[PDB]
Design a protein around this ligand. Structure first.
Ligand SMILES: O=C(O)CCC(=O)C(=O)O
Ligand SMILES: O=C(O)CCC(=O)C(=O)O
Ligand SMILES: [Fe+2]
Ligand SMILES: [Fe+2]
Lengths: 14, 339, 339, 14
């Protein structure tokens, strides 16, 4: 879960 | 060695472009493959999230006829985001983040306007001889003209939708229409979305760096307005502050009308409209990435570690109650302990 | 200036100890207050988690009669952990962590034995003249003799239990009995538990550093066997690796039979049995700290940031699947970005 | 919760 927590990512673009 | 021997425009119209139109940099580059969408090697590259230039997708075939006059007459009168700058470099700025870093001031300003207003200013500079630069970056939406909608519908959704499915990617989040002046440059940065870069008018030199070159490109702190962008000035590299930039190696290519460049998520990309090559028009296709796999494999991949670092910076910033405290805590954590 | 003018033992038995019994260090120190448990200033210090030496608690009054002969005859025959070393420094080692760091080898070995066996070895060295050092560090439990149990029950539980309640601390987790040879030293480190250090026999010089001096004491990486301990050799400080140790300032004092030193959680403490002062006996009282407050106040306190840093190191170690990858990721995160 | 997560601590001693 911690890895899964740290692996999540946003979807930021320009 | 670079983007290779300039391609020859069919009909004996000579070289599509020439070397003197490319800017000069301190680093070496290997060519990104140019293949057919039917070529299994191309499907192999995309599946493995490595860049590839597709020559015959017909992705935006209907748009290949586009130009300022046609778009002005058919794009409608909604507002178009237009960035201005006194330099060829258009550094992106996250305004929601401009609150944090207070003593901060953009090198390029945003401005809304109607398409015809944009063409006017584009024209105003041209006929006088000014040094100002403009870059139109606007999301395609509900307010475009009927004909534009016809073109849009003509896009090769069959091919791309199948690409979306095969990769397990998320949803298409947007299509950014980009119209820039020759010589314009979007500094190296990476995006958190899979991208199908569809070139329509003019030529663009695209320099990509793998995610594993994070330590050579030095991105600004996550809470900084220029988050995800490299702090290194490609035109005048500060090797004292950014030592490992001397070790950076890129992948480049020049895209023209009809080409689609797959920019894998997290890959750095520097994009410039060839010098003295006229305006350029591009339309990208941003897709949310696939979800995190049910089973992690070790060691992690570069883009995953980049995801982890970003998170650590976010957690600390929120935990410390102030983004400016992230750096000091981080330094205190490693100094004399991990370095 | 140090632990102040040596206290005079009642009955005109002269100075309890003298300066030549203290080791010499490169840093300055201010005295920890010596007060009465009835003194509201003492209750003020504890409530604010600052060290204080209590002179009249009677916490371990029944143990003040303890000595090797009495304990040997009454402690029972359970096993007693005894650490050995060829130096006066007894660096702690977490064995569950010795798996990670492979090319690792302790400067002190642990060994089980009966109390009488310990007294034997203590005696063996004495009558010959050896250089070996022993430190008995064993938790008090179910297998101690009847008389020891009588003494234990005689402890001032009324006073300490009330201290436990007033601070909202967790449960008493243990009582470590510590019997060491003169000159022995427990290097600077911090504990994650509130501590009531009860001196019983001999004298100990206690040097404490506030949590906010984390950057001057350079603890080993969290996954290292010596986690929570300073990497700086107090006897020969490496100012090239640990620059800020030149800025460290301590709080010291010398405890004797009857004194109780409150070592607040997260406070660094260096503890040494005075040179040529005979053996020493201490019994500590480790309590889990109070739970995290329902409302966080900003900016955070030093000990909280220390808690945050520790967590970051733990998360990264588990996330990266390998503790040895923590340092490199951390450096990649700050180099040219936060430093 | 994130702060609460990062504020939690063990109870390691000697
Ligand atoms: O074409 C450009 O100048 C920028 C395009 C870009 O950064 C993207 O599509 O992610
Ligand atoms: O007395 C000693 O040598 C060590 C005591 C200690 O580190 C503690 O009680 O936390
Ligand atoms: Fe981009
Ligand atoms: Fe301790």
């Amino acid at each position: 879960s911690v890895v899964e927590y740290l692996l999540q990512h946003g979807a930021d673009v320009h | 060695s670079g983007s290779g021997e300039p391609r020859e425009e069919a009909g004996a119209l000579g070289p599509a472009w020439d070397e003197s139109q490319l800017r000069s940099y301190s680093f070496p580059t290997r060519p990104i493959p140019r293949l057919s969408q039917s070529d299994p090697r191309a499907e192999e590259l995309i599946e493995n999230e490595e860049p590839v230039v597709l020559t015959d997708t017909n992705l935006v075939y209907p748009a290949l006829k586009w130009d300022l006059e046609y778009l002005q007459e058919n794009i409608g009168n909604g507002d178009f985001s237009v960035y201005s700058a006194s330099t060829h470099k258009f550094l992106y700025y996250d305004e929601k983040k401009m609150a944090n870093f207070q003593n901060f001031k953009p090198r390029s300003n945003r401005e809304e306007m109607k398409f015809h207003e944009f063409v006017e200013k584009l024209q105003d500079i041209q006929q006088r001889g000014g040094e100002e630069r403009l870059y139109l970056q606007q999301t395609l939406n509900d307010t475009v003209g009927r004909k534009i909608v016809m073109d849009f519908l003509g896009f090769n959704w069959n091919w791309i939708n199948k690409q979306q499915g095969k990769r397990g990617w998320g949803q298409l989040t947007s299509n950014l229409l980009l119209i820039g002046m020759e010589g314009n440059v979007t500094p190296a940065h990476y995006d958190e979305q899979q991208n199908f870069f569809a070139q329509i008018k003019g030529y663009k030199r695209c320099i990509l760096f793998p995610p594993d070159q994070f330590e050579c490109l030095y991105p600004y702190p996550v809470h900084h307005p220029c988050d995800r962008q490299s702090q290194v000035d490609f035109d005048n590299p500060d090797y004292e502050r950014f030592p490992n930039f001397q070790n950076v190696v890129g992948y480049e290519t020049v895209v023209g009308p009809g080409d689609v460049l797959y920019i894998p998520m997290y890959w750095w990309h520097h994009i410039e409209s060839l010098l003295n090559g006229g305006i350029t028009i591009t339309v990208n296709f941003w897709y949310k990435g696939a979800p995190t796999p049910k089973r992690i494999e070790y060691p992690l991949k570069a883009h995953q570690k980049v995801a982890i670092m970003r998170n650590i910076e976010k957690m600390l910033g929120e935990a410390l109650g102030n983004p400016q405290e992230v750096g000091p805590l981080l330094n205190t954590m490693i100094k004399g302990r991990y370095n």
